[PDB]
């Protein structure tokens, strides 16, 4: 066995990683970089072994030769006697979320509105909605579609970063890590909740998990699910209980990637680390919980029940699926 070196994206992940490392007795140790792309480069250089990635970043990492190893599996919708680690993953619903009180807004009137995205290059926050918008408008000028946005990872002086807020001190505006107040699923949802933006591209679970007291976070603790609507592609608005019939796409779950020569060993270590620190793990919550970070989704999404084995030793294209890959490929023609 070797140690596995995890790559943490920004300082809040680095802190959680350091706590994991200490609890694992250094079976896992930590490298940290400022962005997911830079973590992918550390992994390609062999200076880190692995990290968990949204499907859009899996595409980046997979074009560079890194491979999926285990997928996040959240609470199953339907009944299953299968253990979490063996249950097939179900994909999450990419949605566009607006305030109920913003009554005129539908999918067909998004032009010149303000948008909140998890980050450039992520599935629900970017690849799915911008791919759809490029397609529908017949124009690659997706940087001119919304009047202002927060899209972490875009040029910080551009309209795509105009709404981003940076950290406590207002430094690091638009950096694609958790120090940016509007980064990621919860940041893009907060960007809508605070009416900085008119629309947030997140996933269905984000809305549930940050409303009706499911989050105690100060910006979220008082949000009511009834105050939000989903935007459907047919131009209708639905309550957030209707995401199965009003989503933009089904996304492949976030998954751990590594170099191919390290995957088997990364997989074995992770299966053992989640037996200790995962949901009902032997030492969670007593000592450390790998899948909690007070809603901040650090290293893994907080709704993860386990990391699951993949069927078919899939390549990254197999894992993402041919349609998603082609959608990304098409959108990347614009850049």
């Amino acid at each position: 066995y070797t140690r596995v070196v995890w790559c943490a994206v920004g300082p809040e992940e680095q802190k959680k990683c350091q706590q994991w490392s200490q609890q694992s007795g250094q079976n896992v140790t930590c490298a940290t970089a400022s962005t997911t792309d830079d973590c992918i480069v550390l992994v390609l250089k062999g200076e880190a072994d692995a990290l968990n990635l949204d499907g859009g970043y899996i595409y980046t990492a997979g074009k560079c030769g890194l491979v999926p190893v285990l997928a996040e599996n959240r609470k199953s919708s339907k009944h299953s006697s299968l253990d979490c680690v063996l249950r097939p993953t179900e994909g999450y619903l990419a949605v566009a979320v607006v305030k109920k009180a913003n009554e005129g807004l539908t999918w067909n009137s998004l032009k010149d509105k303000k948008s909140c995205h998890t980050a450039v290059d992520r599935t629900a926050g970017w690849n799915i909605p911008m791919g759809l918008i490029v397609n529908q408008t017949g124009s690659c000028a997706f940087d001119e579609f919304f009047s202002q946005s927060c899209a972490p990872g875009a040029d910080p002086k551009s309209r795509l970063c105009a709404l981003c807020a940076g950290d406590d001190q207002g430094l690091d505006k638009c950096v694609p890590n958790s120090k940016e107040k509007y980064y990621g699923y919860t940041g893009a949802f907060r960007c809508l909740a605070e009416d900085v933006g008119d629309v947030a591209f997140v996933k269905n679970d984000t809305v549930w998990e940050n409303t009706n007291g499911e989050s105690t976070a100060d910006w979220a603790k008082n949000l009511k699910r009834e105050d939000f609507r989903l935007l459907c592609l047919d131009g209708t608005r639905k309550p957030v209980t209707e995401a199965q019939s009003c989503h933009l796409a089904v996304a492949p779950n976030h998954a751990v990637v590594s170099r191919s020569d390290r995957a088997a060993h990364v997989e074995q270590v992770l299966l053992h680390q989640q037996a200790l620190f995962g949901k009902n793990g032997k030492n969670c919550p007593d000592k450390f919980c790998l899948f909690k970070s007070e809603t901040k989704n650090l290293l893994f999404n907080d709704n993860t029940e386990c990391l699951a084995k993949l069927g078919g030793r899939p390549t990254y294209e197999e894992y993402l699926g041919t349609e998603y890959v082609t959608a990304i490929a098409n959108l990347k023609k614009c850049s």
Binding site: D37, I40, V41, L44, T60, K63, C64, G65, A329, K332
Partner: peptide, 6 residues
């Protein structure tokens, strides 16, 4: 649909 970005 081609090479590694890095």
């Amino acid at each position: 649909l081609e090479a590694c970005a890095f």
